[PDB]
């Protein structure tokens, strides 16, 4: 209905750096879109984010059993679940699939855009460079950015703004943590 | 490198709905089906290399409901402001006629987590193998959702995604053509 | 292996 809505959120964030070397646990509580009380593993107890959550921080901090239970979360909770799925989350590798095709911005009689499509790769950290006739084209390149598919794959459409001429040989080079060597795809005009 | 594993929860009133899910670097590892009271792994292979049978996850959402009622009173019954989504339609891979593909409808930056999403081929609703993810959490504490439609590319078919939201005046449509 | 649950705390 047109009735008002009220949203409560809880986020148990585990932040990992250098694997399990530096870990940080955040027990965060939210009302609608705003956080009102937080347990930072760096501090050691609950601290209000807004004045709305001050009763929650004071009430929880006065209970010694609770704080000691959350202070262990870096070892008992964060580091545990990190290693439970490390083999298929941190170490998950999927090969990309690069295809190149021309296109046009405006309805015209010739192509003015050339698209390089990298699809279905994990993790998402990737590098895509454009080359025309061996010389890399830095100017006139418009990237799409990383796109989360929601099914543990990524994609991005880095495209080169150029009117391709007959005889020119374009190449799209991609380097991804899953590839042992740079991957190239050529497109002759 | 840097990794984040967030255990996200919410409870929504008066809808009395809530969900419980884990997240690794933005992707859902699994979620708890509040109706069947079981773990639903986002990728089927996770259910063989991991395990999670938590009756207390339901108890977590029960606590969230109780905490929500107290916070609602604390805020003088301040309701949540509707944040309209930003709908986008894209394909799984590049389009090739007579080569199957997937059409993704990415609903992003919206709250509360309640939406009505439908696929429209030539204005006619479609529901053949349609799929969707749960409400995924964001860094700005808004939500995002995915909808999936396997299809055979053709020039006669024109598709649309109709996403209705309380922050939207009219049902938002985003078209995709070949 | 097997994911823990982090208990959400109740308030008064």
């Amino acid at each position: 209905d047109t009735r008002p809505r009220f949203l409560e959120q809880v986020k148990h964030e585990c932040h990992f750096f250098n694997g399990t070397e530096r870990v940080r646990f955040l027990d965060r509580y939210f009302y609608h879109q705003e956080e009102y009380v937080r347990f930072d593993s760096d501090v050691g107890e609950y601290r209000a984010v807004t004045e709305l959550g001050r009763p929650d921080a004071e009430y929880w901090n006065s209970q010694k059993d609770l704080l000691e239970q959350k202070r262990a979360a870096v070892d008992t909770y964060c580091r545990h679940n990190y290693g439970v799925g490390e083999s298929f989350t941190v170490q998950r590798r999927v090969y990309p699939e690069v295809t190149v095709y021309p296109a046009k911005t405006q309805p015209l009689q010739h192509h003015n855009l050339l698209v390089c499509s990298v699809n279905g790769f994990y993790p998402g950290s990737i590098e895509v460079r454009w080359f025309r006739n061996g010389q890399e084209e830095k100017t006139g390149v418009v990237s799409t950015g990383l796109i989360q598919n929601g099914d543990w794959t990524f994609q991005t459409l880095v495209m080169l703004e150029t009117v391709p001429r007959s005889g020119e040989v374009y190449t799209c080079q991609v380097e991804h943590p899953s590839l042992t060597s740079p991957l190239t795809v050529e497109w002759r005009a | 490198e840097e990794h984040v594993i967030i255990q996200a929860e919410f409870y929504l009133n008066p809808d009395q709905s809530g969900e419980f899910m884990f997240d690794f670097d933005g992707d859902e590892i699994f979620h708890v089906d509040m109706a069947k009271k079981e773990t639903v792994w986002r990728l089927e292979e996770f259910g063989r290399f991991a395990s999670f049978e938590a009756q207390g996850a339901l108890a977590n959402i029960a606590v969230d409901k109780a905490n929500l009622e107290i916070m609602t009173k604390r805020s003088n019954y301040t309701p949540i402001t509707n944040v309209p989504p930003e709908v986008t339609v894209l394909t799984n891979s590049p389009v090739e006629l007579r080569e199957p593909n997937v059409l993704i409808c990415f609903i992003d930056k919206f709250t509360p987590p309640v939406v009505n999403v439908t696929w429209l081929r030539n204005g006619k609703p479609v529901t053949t193998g349609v799929s969707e993810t749960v409400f995924l959490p964001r860094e700005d504490h808004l939500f995002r959702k995915f909808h999936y439609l396997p299809f055979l590319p053709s020039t006669e078919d024109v598709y649309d995604c109709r996403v209705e939201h309380w922050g939207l005046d009219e049902p938002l449509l985003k078209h995709w053509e070949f | 292996d097997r994911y823990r649950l982090n208990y959400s705390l109740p308030t008064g």
Partner: T-cell receptor
Framework: QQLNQSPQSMFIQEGEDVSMNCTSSSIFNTWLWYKQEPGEGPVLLIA?????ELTSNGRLTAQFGITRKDSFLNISASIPSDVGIYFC??????????????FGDGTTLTVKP | GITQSPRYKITETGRQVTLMCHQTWSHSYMFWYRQDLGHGLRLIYYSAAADITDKGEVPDGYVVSRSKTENFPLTLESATRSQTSVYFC??????????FGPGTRLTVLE
């Protein structure tokens, strides 16, 4: 019996010291110690949530074994009021997900005066 | 506070009796145990939250219900003489720590 509580029967003259053991068949994350007075229900004595912790509560002191599978409780300067059963509880990952605690069989302490 | 009722109970064989456990702490978790000689505490049933129930070590011969966060009624279906025990009820706001009740001494007689 996923939790082995030894000993189960003790006879301690006043002033002497008591030490109870408790071993786990799975890696534990928390340990609980209870005491059941005759005719009453078991109540909580000490809780330990960190490995190698050594928490005290008067003459009671309890240790969280670094094996994540052992736990001890000591009662210094035994008085006759310390009679009763002492339970040892804990949680593994499965327990934490279910919100339950596995209990040991217990130790029946009889302090003679 | 967790409280039990009845505290003592003599029932006949084959009859249906239901022991009640009431808590005002608004705790989410509740538990029903039975303490005998040589077995210690043994979980019969328990409830993570309202409208949620699961079985424990000794769930045969018993049923349970939890339609509210206050009451967790343990119910013997058909009273057997093997069910003569001391029944304890516990609760938890945030586990593992539990708060037990005074207990109930049930005696099933022919």
């Amino acid at each position: 019996q996923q939790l082995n509580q030894s000993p189960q029967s003790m006879f301690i003259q006043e002033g002497e010291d008591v030490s109870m053991n408790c071993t786990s068949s799975s890696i534990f994350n928390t340990w609980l110690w209870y005491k059941q007075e005759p005719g009453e229900g078991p109540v909580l004595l000490i809780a330990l949530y960190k490995a190698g912790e050594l928490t005290s509560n008067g003459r009671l002191t309890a240790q969280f074994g670094i094996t994540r599978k052992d736990s001890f409780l000591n009662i210094s300067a035994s008085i006759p009021s310390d009679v009763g059963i002492y339970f040892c509880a804990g949680q593994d990952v499965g327990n934490t997900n279910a919100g339950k605690s596995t209990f040991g069989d217990g130790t029946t302490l009889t302090v003679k005066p | 506070g967790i409280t039990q009722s009845p505290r003592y109970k003599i029932t006949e064989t084959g009859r249906q009796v239901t022991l009640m456990c009431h808590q005002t702490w608004s705790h989410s978790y509740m538990f029903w145990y039975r303490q005998d000689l040589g077995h210690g505490l043994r979980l019969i049933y328990y409830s993570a939250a309202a409208d949620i129930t699961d079985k424990g070590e000794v769930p045969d011969g018993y049923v349970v219900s939890r339609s509210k966060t206050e009451n967790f009624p343990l119910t013997l279906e058909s009273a057997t003489r093997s069910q003569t025990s001391v029944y304890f009820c516990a609760s938890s706001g945030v586990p593992p720590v539990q708060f037990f009740g005074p207990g109930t001494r049930l005696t099933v007689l022919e």
